[PDB]
Curated annotation (Swiss-Prot), chain C:
Subunit structure comment from the entry: May form a homodimer or a heterodimer with a related family member. Interacts with OLA1, TMA17, and UBR1.
First and last residue of the signal peptide: none
Domain of life of the source: Eukaryota
Lineage: Eukaryota, Fungi, Dikarya, Ascomycota, Saccharomycotina
Gene name as annotated: RPT6
Official protein name in the record: 26S proteasome regulatory subunit 8 homolog
Post-translational modification summary for this protein: N-acetylated by NAT1.
Function per UniProt: The 26S proteasome is involved in the ATP-dependent degradation of ubiquitinated proteins. The regulatory (or ATPase) complex confers ATP dependency and substrate specificity to the 26S complex.
Leftover remarks: Present with 4700 molecules/cell in log phase SD medium.
Localisation: Cytoplasm; Nucleus
Residues shown, of full length: 52 to 102 of 405
Family of this protein: Belongs to the AAA ATPase family.
UniProtKB/Swiss-Prot annotation, chain D:
Lineage top rank: taxon: Eukaryota
Disulfide bonds: none
Protein name, as recorded: 26S proteasome regulatory subunit 6B homolog
Function: The 26S proteasome is involved in the ATP-dependent degradation of ubiquitinated proteins. The regulatory (or ATPase) complex confers ATP dependency and substrate specificity to the 26S complex.
Family per similarity comment: Belongs to the AAA ATPase family.
Record's comment on post-translational modification: N-acetylated by NAT3.
Cellular localization per UniProt: Cytoplasm; Nucleus
Shown segment, full-protein numbering: 35 to 84 of 428
Curated annotation (Swiss-Prot), chain E:
Residue window of the full protein shown: 255 to 304 of 338
Record function comment: Acts as a regulatory subunit of the 26S proteasome which is involved in the ATP-dependent degradation of ubiquitinated proteins.
Protein name: 26S proteasome regulatory subunit RPN8
Annotated source species: Saccharomyces cerevisiae (strain ATCC 204508 / S288c)
Miscellaneous information on this protein: Present with 19800 molecules/cell in log phase SD medium.
Family per record: Belongs to the peptidase M67A family.
Name of the gene: RPN8
Curated annotation (Swiss-Prot), chain F:
Function: Acts as a regulatory subunit of the 26S proteasome which is involved in the ATP-dependent degradation of ubiquitinated proteins.
Similarity field: Belongs to the proteasome subunit S1 family.
Designated name of the protein: 26S proteasome regulatory subunit RPN2
PTM section of the record: N-acetylated by NAT1.
Assembly and interaction partners: Interacts with UBR1.
Domain of life of the source: Eukaryota
Taxonomic classification: Eukaryota, Fungi, Dikarya, Ascomycota, Saccharomycotina
Other known facts: Present with 4750 molecules/cell in log phase SD medium.
PC repeats: 79-112, 116-153, 158-192, 193-227, 229-262, 263-284
Length: 212, 289, 51, 50, 50, 284
């Protein structure tokens, strides 16, 4: 996400103010386009163990209901010009048939009475006896965001969190990891108090250090 | 490749634009020609300082109508006073056509390019400068071999992407696809802005110059009379016009060709005049005597 | 602002190359129209995307 | 009363009001300006009519 | 002075015409605004439901 | 180590790795519609690609759509090598290492690639680039003595943008000295990069020597890129200065030329940044 400033003290980010004056002049000189990179800031909640200093895996409680994790898709479809064309073709031929067809219907019926209806004898007493529809029900989510709520869902540690769903975060007190102070109410580096340094903890080892 | 490789933004000096215009206008209808003298800085900034005309011909613009003698001699005159630079290109007039090089000029531009590869051709219309807006455009060739090598996007790198066009079909095909256009901007100092801005020595002393009062009486009489007739027109308009659908009503009862707007306009106009006329008389009577 | 930017935009709009009155003699099914211009002669000429 | 620390938050209202009426001085900034903008457009109206 | 006085009175009549007409439009836009509220209720609601 | 800020560079790389999910159809669309032959078209795509993959390695598009990449030329191609360092941003151990075939001594295919590796290096090491500064300085001093050549100018340009990002905010007097020599040579296009690069480094110092030097030099130059660049660079160096920079704002607005006014506005913006001053807004 693009931030105007740090939200931790509400004080100007230096990388952001420069970034934007350079970016915005770009009818003038096109290579000043990569300067926007200094504005983009990563948004994630980062736990730090107190005894080893590394990221543990554990789950924080996040109140109903998700403002992200959609990941919607882009596509192109050009094969639907063929589907459209035959749909209308099959529709049209029936209309034309209207005059021949009346004469057929009278002769057609006795054939069905004798043999079978369509794949079994059963249910030839009406022309159609079975109508309806199996679903009419659909409301998806019960609101786009339900604020502070009593409904929990679980979120992982190092997940894509935006500030709107970041507020709903409450670090659990069953597990070891609870902040030394309190939460700050936003995304960012936050150091957590390790209850057990001697019980097994699942950790995520940073990418650069594995490769080294 | 290794440079900006784009056509210069021709910055035409305050002197120069007027001088091409005066020189093109005298010869209308016959085609005019001449040299642009200037200096080349950047890779894409040519400031054209001054101009000189190459004399008339009886077959008008030709490559042939270039004469080395006139060009070089006139050049040695300016040398002695040290106002000479280097030939950055040339101007010529199509007053019978729009902005675009004619079939002859593209071949003249090829010779000129050869000598100096930054050579521009500026086509001046002295006959479409009888407007409030001067019609003037600049072009420079992109070679036939160049189009084959597909080096056309090279010329439009590092620009605002704002180009000029002139009519459609034939004119436009020549413009974009065989030559390249770049906008023209106007360059000036604050010394020259003052020289143009000035006028007479009694233009700054023309509000004491009252008018003859016969003429001011005329102004009084006309405005009052005319407003009686547009007012009459204003009465007819608002007798109806109050059913539904606004445009319809305005088409029906003369609400288009609006008298309401026009009555206000006349009144205001004659109103601002007469405040100053009273002001003028009251100053001159008391001030002088 | 509506007023002053209506004047400035009508200065562009008034500037034409000349836009004529023609009459259609007949069509041709190559997607072109034989138009006799009312003063001038006939020219088979393509059509726009609105017609 | 029935809920105490009703004399800390009473004063937060007051604190907020002194901020907000400065941001309606940002509309009195604008007020002079919309007078100098229409003034400018009346000038350029003259220039477009010319 | 006399034509300036007559012209001053003339503009008063055109401007007072405009005065009334703004006030007639307000009366019509009132009707429209009241029907609008029923329609906005359904618009508020749809946003809560989805 | 915590206060150095090294830890936090690492942390952002694992987060970007774990949830990387890239909509491929958007790129396939972009590529198909906007031809790589046309320069504006190619550059637009490249910027978008550098963004999309920023801060994780990804040369996946480059290999797959190598013919499309190969269409580019001039300054669009200058863009295409500068996209790489948006992509490989972070990863400060490997930061020099992955640009090694593109950096000089290892390159000679087009001068575009040699130049834009230097720009893309500055991007990798932004904010932590203090050792990177020495590297890029050497390059500038050797090639600031001559700039009559084509190769030197494209190469020197990236270097000059590069050391801006690397010495950013550091108030390094060395970076100033080195780029000043570029300005004074009065280079074709590296005069812009030099001037911008200087205010990049020297952010909000408001040194009077710098303000005076840059103000005077805008009159002397006669290349259009430099006149603009120095107007912006003035705004940059007078970040946070407010009332300090007030003499310079008055002068730049009053100049009858367009270019000094164009920076002139952004000197208010950066000087009165985040302030709630009616007067700062009233001027603009």
């Amino acid at each position: 996400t693009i931030q105007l400033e740090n939200a931790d003290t509400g004080t100007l980010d230096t990388k952001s103010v420069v970034g934007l004056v350079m970016f915005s002049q770009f009818w003038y000189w096109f290579p000043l386009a990569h300067f926007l990179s200094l504005s983009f800031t990563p948004t994630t909640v980062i736990g730090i163990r107190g005894s080893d200093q590394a990221i543990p895996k554990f789950q924080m409680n996040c109140y109903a209901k998700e403002d992200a994790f959609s990941y919607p898709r882009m596509y192109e479809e050009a094969s639907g010009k063929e589907v459209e064309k035959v749909a209308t073709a099959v529709l049209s031929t029936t209309a034309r048939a209207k005059a021949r067809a009346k004469k057929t219907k009278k002769e057609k019926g006795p054939n069905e009475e004798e043999k079978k209806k369509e794949h079994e004898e059963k249910e030839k007493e009406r022309e159609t006896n079975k109508k309806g529809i199996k679903e009419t029900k659909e409301n998806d989510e019960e609101f786009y965001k339900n604020k502070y709520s009593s409904k929990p869902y679980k979120v992982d540690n190092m997940t894509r969190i935006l500030p709107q769903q970041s507020r709903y975060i409450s670090f659990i007190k069953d597990d070891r990891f609870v902040p030394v102070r309190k939460f700050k109410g936003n995304n960012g580096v936050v150091v957590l108090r390790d209850r057990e340094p001697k019980e097994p903890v699942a950790l995520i080892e940073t990418v650069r250090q594995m490769k080294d | 490749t290794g440079r900006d490789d784009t056509k210069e933004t021709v910055y035409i000096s305050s002197i120069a634009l007027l001088k091409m215009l005066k020189h093109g206008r005298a010869g209308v209808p016959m085609e005019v020609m001449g040299l642009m003298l200037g200096e080349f800085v950047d890779d894409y900034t040519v400031n054209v300082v001054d101009v000189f005309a190459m004399p008339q011909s009886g077959t008008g613009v030709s490559v042939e109508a270039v004469d080395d003698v006139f060009q070089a001699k006139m050049m040695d005159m300016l040398k002695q006073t040290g106002r000479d630079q280097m030939v950055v290109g040339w101007y010529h007039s199509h007053p019978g056509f729009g902005c675009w090089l004619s079939s002859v000029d593209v071949n003249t531009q090829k010779s000129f390019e050869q000598l100096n590869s930054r050579a521009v051709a500026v086509v001046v219309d002295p006959i479409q400068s009888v407007k409030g807006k001067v019609v003037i455009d600049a072009f420079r060739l992109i070679d036939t071999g160049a189009l084959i090598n597909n080096l056309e996007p090279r010329q439009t790198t590092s620009n605002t992407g704002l180009l000029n066009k002139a009519n459609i079909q034939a004119l436009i095909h020549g413009l974009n696809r065989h030559y390249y256009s770049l906008n023209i901007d106007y360059h000036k100092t604050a010394k020259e802005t003052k020289m143009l801005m000035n006028l007479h020595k009694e233009q700054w002393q023309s509000g004491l110059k009252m008018y003859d009062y016969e003429e001011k009486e005329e102004s009084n009489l006309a405005a009052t009379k005319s407003m009686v007739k547009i007012a009459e027109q204003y009465s007819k308009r608002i007798e109806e016009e109050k059913e539904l659908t606004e445009e319809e009503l305005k088409t029906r009862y003369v609400g288009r060709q609006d008298p309401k707007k026009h009555l206000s306009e006349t009144a205001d106009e004659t109103l601002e005049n007469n405040i100053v006329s009273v002001l003028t008389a009251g100053v001159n009577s008391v001030a002088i005597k | 602002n509506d007023k002053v930017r209506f004047i400035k935009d009508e200065l562009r709009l008034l500037q034409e190359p000349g836009s004529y009155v023609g009459e259609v003699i007949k069509i041709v099914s190559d997607k072109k129209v034989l138009v006799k211009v009312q003063p001038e002669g006939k020219y088979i000429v393509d059509v726009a995307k609105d017609i | 009363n029935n809920n105490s620390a009703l004399s800390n938050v009473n004063s937060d209202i007051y604190f907020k009001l002194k901020k907000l009426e400065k941001e309606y001085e940002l509309l009195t900034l604008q007020e002079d300006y919309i007078k100098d903008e229409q003034r400018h457009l009346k000038r350029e109206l003259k220039r477009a009519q010319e | 002075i006399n034509i300036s006085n007559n012209l001053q009175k003339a503009l008063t009549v055109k401007t007072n015409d405009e005065l009334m007409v703004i006030y007639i439009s307000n009366l019509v836009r009132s009707i429209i605004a009241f029907d609008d509220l029923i329609e906005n209720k359904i618009q508020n609601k749809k946003i809560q439901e989805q | 180590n915590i206060l150095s800020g090294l830890p936090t560079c690492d942390y952002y790389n694992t987060f970007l790795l774990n949830n990387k999910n890239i909509d491929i159809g958007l790129l396939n669309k972009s590529k198909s519609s906007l031809d790589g032959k046309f320069s504006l078209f190619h550059t637009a795509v490249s910027v978008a690609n550098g963004f999309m993959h920023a801060g994780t390695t990804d040369n996946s598009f480059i290999k797959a759509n190598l013919p499309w990449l190969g269409k580019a030329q001039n300054w669009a191609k200058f863009t295409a090598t500068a996209s790489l360092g948006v992509i490989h941003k972070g990863n400060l151990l490997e930061g020099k290492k992955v640009m090694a075939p593109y950096l000089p001594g290892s390159r000679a295919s087009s001068r575009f690639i040699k130049g834009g590796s230097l720009y893309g290096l500055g991007l990798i090491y932004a904010g932590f680039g203090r050792d990177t500064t020495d590297y890029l300085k050497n390059i500038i001093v050797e090639n600031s003595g001559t700039s009559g050549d084509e190769d030197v100018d494209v190469l020197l340009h990236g270097a000059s943008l590069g050391i801006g990002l690397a010495a950013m905010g550091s108030a390094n007097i060395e970076v100033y000295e080195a780029l000043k020599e570029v300005l004074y040579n009065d280079s074709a296009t590296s005069g812009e990069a030099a001037a911008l690069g200087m205010g990049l480094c020297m952010l909000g110092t408001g040194k009077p020597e710098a303000i005076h030097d840059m103000f005077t030099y805008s009159q002397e130059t006669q290349h259009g890129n430099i006149t603009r660049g120095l107007a912006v660079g003035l705004a940059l160096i007078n970040y946070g200065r407010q009332e300090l920079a007030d003499d310079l704002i008055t002068k730049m607005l009053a100049s009858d030329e367009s270019l000094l006014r164009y920076g002139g506005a952004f000197t208010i913006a950066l000087a009165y940044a985040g302030t709630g001053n009616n007067s700062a807004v009233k001027r603009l």
